[PDB]
Amino acid sequence: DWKKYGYNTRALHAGYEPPEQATGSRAVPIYQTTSYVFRDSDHAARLFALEEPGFIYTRIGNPTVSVLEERIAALEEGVGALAVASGQAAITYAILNIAGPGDEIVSGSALYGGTYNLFRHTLYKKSGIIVKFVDETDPKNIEEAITEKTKAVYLETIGNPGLTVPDFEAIAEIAHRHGVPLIVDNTVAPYIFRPFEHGADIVVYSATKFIGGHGTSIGGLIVDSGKFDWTNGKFPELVEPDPSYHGVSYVETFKEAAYIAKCRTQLLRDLGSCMSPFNAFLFILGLETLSLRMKKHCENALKIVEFLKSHPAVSWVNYPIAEGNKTRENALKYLKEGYGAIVTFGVKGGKEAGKKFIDSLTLISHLANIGDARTLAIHPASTTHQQLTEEEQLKTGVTPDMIRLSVGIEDVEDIIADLDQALRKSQE
Amino acid sequence: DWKKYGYNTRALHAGYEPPEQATGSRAVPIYQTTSYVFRDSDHAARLFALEEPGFIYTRIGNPTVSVLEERIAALEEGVGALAVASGQAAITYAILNIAGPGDEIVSGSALYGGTYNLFRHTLYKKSGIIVKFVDETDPKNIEEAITEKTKAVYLETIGNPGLTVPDFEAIAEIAHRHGVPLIVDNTVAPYIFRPFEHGADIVVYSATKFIGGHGTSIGGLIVDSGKFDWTNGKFPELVEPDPSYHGVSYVETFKEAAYIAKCRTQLLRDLGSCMSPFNAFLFILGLETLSLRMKKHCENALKIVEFLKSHPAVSWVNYPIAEGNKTRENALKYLKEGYGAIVTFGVKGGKEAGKKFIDSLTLISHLANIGDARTLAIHPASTTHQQLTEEEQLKTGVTPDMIRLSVGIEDVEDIIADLDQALRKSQE
Amino acid sequence: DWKKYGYNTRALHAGYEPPEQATGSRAVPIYQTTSYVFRDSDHAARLFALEEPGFIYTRIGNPTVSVLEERIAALEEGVGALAVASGQAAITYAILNIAGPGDEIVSGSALYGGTYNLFRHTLYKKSGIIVKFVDETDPKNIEEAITEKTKAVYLETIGNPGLTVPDFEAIAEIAHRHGVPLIVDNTVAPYIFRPFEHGADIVVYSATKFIGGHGTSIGGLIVDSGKFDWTNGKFPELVEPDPSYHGVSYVETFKEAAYIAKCRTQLLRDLGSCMSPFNAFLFILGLETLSLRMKKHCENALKIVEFLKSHPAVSWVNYPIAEGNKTRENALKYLKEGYGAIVTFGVKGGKEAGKKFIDSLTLISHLANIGDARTLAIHPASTTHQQLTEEEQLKTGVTPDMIRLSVGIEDVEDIIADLDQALRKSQE
Amino acid sequence: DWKKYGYNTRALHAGYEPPEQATGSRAVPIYQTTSYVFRDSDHAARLFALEEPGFIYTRIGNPTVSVLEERIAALEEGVGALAVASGQAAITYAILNIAGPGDEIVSGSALYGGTYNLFRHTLYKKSGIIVKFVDETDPKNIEEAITEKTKAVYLETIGNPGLTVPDFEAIAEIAHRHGVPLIVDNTVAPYIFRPFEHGADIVVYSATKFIGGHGTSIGGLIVDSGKFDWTNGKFPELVEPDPSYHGVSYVETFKEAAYIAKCRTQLLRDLGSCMSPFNAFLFILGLETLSLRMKKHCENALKIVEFLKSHPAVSWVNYPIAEGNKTRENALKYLKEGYGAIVTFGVKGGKEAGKKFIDSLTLISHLANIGDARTLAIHPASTTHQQLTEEEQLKTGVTPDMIRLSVGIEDVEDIIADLDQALRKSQE
Numbered sequence A, B, C, D: 001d002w003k004k005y006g007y008n009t010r011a012l013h014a015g016y017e018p019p020e021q022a023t024g025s026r027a028v029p030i031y032q033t034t035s036y037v038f039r040d041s042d043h044a045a046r047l048f049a050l051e052e053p054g055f056i057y058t059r060i061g062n063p064t065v066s067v068l069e070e071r072i073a074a075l076e077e078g079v080g081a082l083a084v085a086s087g088q089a090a091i092t093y094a095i096l097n098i099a100g101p102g103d104e105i106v107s108g109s110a111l112y113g114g115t116y117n118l119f120r121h122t123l124y125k126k127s128g129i130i131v132k133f134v135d136e137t138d139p140k141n142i143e144e145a146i147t148e149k150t151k152a153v154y155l156e157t158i159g160n161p162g163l164t165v166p167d168f169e170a171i172a173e174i175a176h177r178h179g180v181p182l183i184v185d186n187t188v189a190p191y192i193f194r195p196f197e198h199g200a201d202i203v204v205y206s207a208t209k210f211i212g213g214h215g216t217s218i219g220g221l222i223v224d225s226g227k228f229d230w231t232n233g234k235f236p237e238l239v240e241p242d243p244s245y246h247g248v249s250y251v252e253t254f255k256e257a258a259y260i261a262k263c264r265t266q267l268l269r270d271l272g273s274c275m276s277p278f279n280a281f282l283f284i285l286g287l288e289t290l291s292l293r294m295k296k297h298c299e300n301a302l303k304i305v306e307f308l309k310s311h312p313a314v315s316w317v318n319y320p321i322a323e324g325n326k327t328r329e330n331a332l333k334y335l336k337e338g339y340g341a342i343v344t345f346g347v348k349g350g351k352e353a354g355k356k357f358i359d360s361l362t363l364i365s366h367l368a369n370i371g372d373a374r375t376l377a378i379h380p381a382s383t384t385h386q387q388l389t390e391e392e393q394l395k396t397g398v399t400p401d402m403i404r405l406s407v408g409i410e411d412v413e414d415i416i417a418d419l420d421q422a423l424r425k426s427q428e
Helices: A007-013 A041-048 A063-076 A087-096 A113-127 A139-145 A168-177 A250-271 A277-287 A290-309 A328-334 A350-360 A390-395 A412-426 B007-013 B041-048 B063-076 B087-096 B113-127 B139-145 B168-177 B250-271 B277-287 B290-309 B328-334 B350-360 B390-395 B412-426 C007-013 C041-048 C063-076 C087-096 C113-127 C139-145 C168-177 C250-271 C277-287 C290-309 C328-334 C350-360 C390-395 C412-426 D007-013 D041-048 D063-076 D087-096 D113-127 D139-145 D168-177 D250-271 D277-287 D290-309 D328-334 D350-360 D390-395 D412-426
Strands: A080-084 A104-108 A130-134 A150-156 A182-185 A202-206 A220-224 A314-318 A342-347 A376-378 A402-406 B080-084 B104-108 B130-134 B150-156 B182-185 B202-206 B220-224 B314-318 B342-347 B376-378 B402-406 C080-084 C104-108 C130-134 C150-156 C182-185 C202-206 C220-224 C314-318 C342-347 C376-378 C402-406 D080-084 D104-108 D130-134 D150-156 D182-185 D202-206 D220-224 D314-318 D342-347 D376-378 D402-406
Touching: A007 A063, A007 A290, A041 B350, A063 A080, A063 A220, A063 A277, A080 A087, A080 A250, A087 A113, A087 A150, A087 A182, A087 A202, A087 A220, A087 A250, A087 B250, A113 A130, A113 B113, A113 B250, A130 A139, A139 A168, A150 A168, A168 A182, A220 A250, A250 B087, A250 B113, A277 B277, A277 C277, A290 A314, A290 A342, A290 A412, A290 C290, A342 A350, A350 A376, A350 A402, A350 A412, A350 B041, B007 B063, B007 B290, B063 B080, B063 B220, B063 B277, B080 B087, B080 B250, B087 B113, B087 B150, B087 B182, B087 B202, B087 B220, B087 B250, B113 B130, B130 B139, B139 B168, B150 B168, B168 B182, B220 B250, B277 D277, B290 B314, B290 B342, B290 B412, B290 D290, B342 B350, B350 B376, B350 B402, B350 B412, C007 C063, C007 C290, C041 D350, C063 C080, C063 C220, C063 C277, C080 C087, C080 C250, C087 C113, C087 C150, C087 C182, C087 C202, C087 C220, C087 C250, C087 D250, C113 C130, C113 D113, C113 D250, C130 C139, C139 C168, C150 C168, C168 C182, C220 C250, C250 D087, C250 D113, C277 D277, C290 C314, C290 C342, C290 C412, C342 C350, C350 C376, C350 C402, C350 C412, C350 D041, D007 D063, D007 D290, D063 D080, D063 D220, D063 D277, D080 D087, D080 D250, D087 D113, D087 D150, D087 D182, D087 D202, D087 D220, D087 D250, D113 D130, D130 D139, D139 D168, D150 D168, D168 D182, D220 D250, D290 D314, D290 D342, D290 D412, D342 D350, D350 D376, D350 D402, D350 D412
Parallel strands: A104 A130, A104 A150, A150 A182, A182 A202, B104 B130, B104 B150, B150 B182, B182 B202, C104 C130, C104 C150, C150 C182, C182 C202, D104 D130, D104 D150, D150 D182, D182 D202
Antiparallel strands: A080 A220, A202 A220, A314 A342, A342 A402, A376 A402, B080 B220, B202 B220, B314 B342, B342 B402, B376 B402, C080 C220, C202 C220, C314 C342, C342 C402, C376 C402, D080 D220, D202 D220, D314 D342, D342 D402, D376 D402
16 A cells, blocks of 8 residues: 555555455465465566566565565555564664675664674674764764765664664754765654654664564564665665676666665575564564554553652653653654653662562563563663673663663553552662 | 484474473474563573573574474584574574684585575675685595685585585595584485584584475574584684673683584674574474485485486486486495485476476476475576576586476376476477 | 453453463463373373363363463453354354253344354254344343243344344343343454443353454354352253263362353363464454554444445444434443444445445455454345345344445544445446 | 375375465465455355355365365365364264264264263263264174164274274175265374275364374364265255255255265354364475375384383283284274374283383373374373273273373384383382
């Protein structure tokens, strides 16, 4: 389905209208298959030469996985999407598509720990890429770090768990004036934020979190807006003839889809971070309720915040629109549908009190995740961010006394009662 | 289970004895979950610091996926295995674990097309790695290409579809004398060949093909023999303190498992090519019959070869032990359980006759795969190897008139009848 | 979880707190297994004798299926539930548990076609049970049909598709004064109606429809309120010693759970209508969003009704609270959360116009189902009710010109636009 | 595929040639769907009236489930099959299709406990059917129990666990001379026995056991040979017009498939024991290796028997061809491919020694099942047959000191070593 239809209609229909014509299955089939029989040899040759569309091999493309991709692109109003094995793989592929040995990336610092470790260590040692980390709360800091080796600017929508919101439009202008795309990780804010409306060229998701929403499946997505001009000379693999496809120019053959086409034909084909069709089936199920779920997550989170602000065992609370938040103005400007499910706070008595808070919980789940329907809590400095030095954790908005909550869609009075009994026990 | 038990007992038990203690499930549960609740904060901290074993997050580790890994390691007599999203990802990770920008790899040339394209283009452009391709039919050619920048030697067990078998022991000696591991891709010969018995240090699989065996699931495996010494100075990431894990030395903490540990803790955690637990469940089912299946594949293939050799529309036939095969001696020496399922031949009348052969088939499936229970046929020069120049295809053992068959486990008289009617039609 | 927690908290937690202790999986594992290893022979004997709780065999009981059952019982505030292969099997088992050859059942006539055919033909010919059908819009009609052979009264919550709502409290009093339970089929109104609050003793569900909510899985549920007294002499199988379990009296051993215990130990064990653990996994996912989904279904349906009432191609519209509905008073009294997703209407030009309405639709799915997230339409007289005579269809509230809609959770303006273009085309 | 193709070719192809034409999926898709969109209203009407073939609703029919059914029918050389939720449901439906209140069934007594309990108690109390149990080791005993109320004769292929084999041809003649079909439960002997070659008219399977073969899925099958004449006056529901389908005569419309058609259209539609498409997918995977698996099961079992016969802690051993077996002649005559996987024996020291045997095992699984790839052991008198009196257990071939083994496909020396250490411990 198209831009003329509403978000919820797309979330239920896009990419699977009409149903497959073999049997009419209303539900998207799970095509748990590796291979696809060809009509004849000409079919088979056209498919491999990129001269006709069809399925060849599940590593490269699969019908269940394609419905997921098409529906995500429709919801984002992008020109195409690619599904991959994890949010990490989506980030990896989004960068590696346009960068390699000797290249630079300007990144914000309000980052999930796993992105930090990929950027700072793995991409440098295994791909020769230098990521330059900046305080994205001031857009001038992004401009000052761009160089002729920069290939992209990278931001998260709501800094997990710093809870800062960058000025997307200002930073997108900076990236475009310097001839590079803005890539946004919108993991924590599907539906409530549309990056392509605000300057982003590329969106990645950890479909694992909110998109799936039920804590069952690992997966990632890369979405291409199709509006960046790859021919400025900084992205020659998207322009020059590709020896692997006998001379194909991606911009020439695939036009506005050049980028997501190469992600598939080069990186997915060769590095092989494909999603399972079963996992795709479950993510499609998640999308069908995503907007209802996100509205409830965000309504509960705002209530949780107000509860915590007035509680005697709590020393501070953060939320994208909290009074002390340095980017609340950006949160107000760009998030008009809810301000995310993630809430941080500190317990009086520091790290050891937070320890006893976590240990006392009876309904909230002490685990490593966000974006489950259930409410989740953790201590980031010793978990999601343990790979970082004390100085590094502070750059990303992570302190030693911090508790992160991913607020779920339980009845809020039950969440608050678990929080209260556990906060009382932490002061004993 | 251990080295004292037979292959089939291990294939049915290793890694899941005793059954999980929650309910006693005899079958391996499908843990379709992202996360795992922790006992308390100390548990959670020990797990992330690598100070205690347990599950944290399915990208990094999962109980269903772990049973698969443990059973593959037991069958291989390796010290550990890692599961990943595809055979391509396993190859990628096996190399990237020990190589990066400016490094070299010596590879054989009897290679699946997808490995060629990863080696020649993707790893060079995205990782700065120079793969040097050699004629592995003479081990002297491997020695002559090693340099001080070489990090590994790479071979396939039965060249897909050149059908050549390298001299593993001679090449393993060369690699070890030069301080680098031998990595073997044993995709086409699980059970019938044990690389670790013949000098290989690392084995990778495309679990997709024969291990799964039913054409349902994409997946890869990396298996570590645990016998290579990573401390010779060429593998400093396996020895030096890792900043991402606050100073952990992989050889010191994980000893013989240093390599497969870093594959998990670095590459899987950051690049994110994880396998789905559903896919793992299906690969475990495949292992339970693998030895029966491989014996039938190889018995049928040898019969198919004899049929083709005497048929009037066939100009030539290849098989690892065919009289004209330049490495039949190696095939005889190393494959004592069967000589693989893959068979090549040429039709009289060249490419256009093979075209009409493929188009006439009625039971054999014209698709891109090997290792299905069903019998498969294809024309490689325009498909699995289309990414290669005419000169390059010839280096890998692929001609323009070649038909590749993956012989399945149907009743051989039905396979032969389909082959015969289609060969008659190709001469019209 | 317990009656102290809210509906949404239960829907996310009940039956799986704490997570399984083997690994801590936050998601409910898919235990796709037939069998469960026993600790020793005493364990195994106690389990089969009904002297200890545990798992023995998936036909009889399974850990994934048990979580589903426990969560449904918690949401219903029943004492237990049983999962089965379909809504039809749940109805069958709910009756067969308490009735057999020579017994009677008093049923309402506002019935899904499949229930009618089971009641009128299959149970009579294969079980000797006489179902007496009555106009349940007047409770006096239920009393007048009870006899000393009656074993239960049976009602649907919202007559599918007559859209009538019975007076539950009045009819429950009648059944209880005559010593028989009231069994309610609450398929179309989970969450929005709680039968046990209004006199029902037994609830059955077609988990297929709204509970699943995504059109993926067939399944049924039987829920026992635990408040009916089975010892009045009409239910001797629940009281007398059971030879199959060496003398067990169900009321004595299982107390308030006697009924659902026999459903498992007798009917599920012997007739074998078990649910798959995969299907159960998906129904659990459905429950996690059920209340959000049902509120949206009912809000959209009420809007659709208002649209249809004012449209020139529509001759009439029905809805439980429509002005002409003979039971709107009951709908107002008992449904305080929404009035269901099902809407009927007639097109001007009769059966052939409705034909052209269905044939013109472009977003609404012409299929046999209700309770999908997508909007569905059909012509019942030739489909869901085709097994009934013209007189019989009229007894159930089905006319020849009727269109049934199951209103989904798409954006209502998109539903209405599809309805309007198709209604215009029907008048051409 | 057809009778011209071999068993293994059929097991890999029948029912899914050609692959679905939407995408060409070589693997059978998992159609996890409830519903199927119709082309238009005429389509929808023809489908419900039984005037055209197609899919309507997964309770009644599903594309994945249909491939399973078609492949089983092809392997059996039957005219059709029906899939159901369990082996118990298949037995139930096979009888209820042709019998009801006041009818009789002549059954053998060499029966799985669950069949006994269905026959003796559940079908009598819930369906009014009188099963007459006879010593089927003498065919004269079958003739002497037939009456004008008899509707079928029922046998198991290898009495589980009496291990007796009836004289199928003699008993089939008796049933046919008296105008009733012979129904065979071939659960324990797929592939190794073809009941339709020896007089059976109807075959049922517990697909759970050997057909699946991996202990993952519950399921049943009913297979119709299509050769019984239902018009002799004893089966009027198969001849007379069916009110539920407006006058359809099953023999007239469906001809040789009348029986399996009514199983679907009446019993599956109304009692609702449908199989999940996921479970069907797994059973199809099992079929692909069934013949290799059964040959290995039977070869290992015969070796286990010889080991047990010579062991000092064993007092007796039974096997269909054991020297003391009263039906070894029948086993020799009818089983020409292997004599089943099931082995019974007694330990010196009686029930308490067998207790200590079971408790000592370290590789063989103490669970309730047969037909897993793994080797299984149990004590039937307190488990699979606990529902029967001491007299009743003895009628079925079950004593108090009996150990039943389901011999798996592990390496036999590992099975024997587990058996030996556990037999030594039982004598302490």
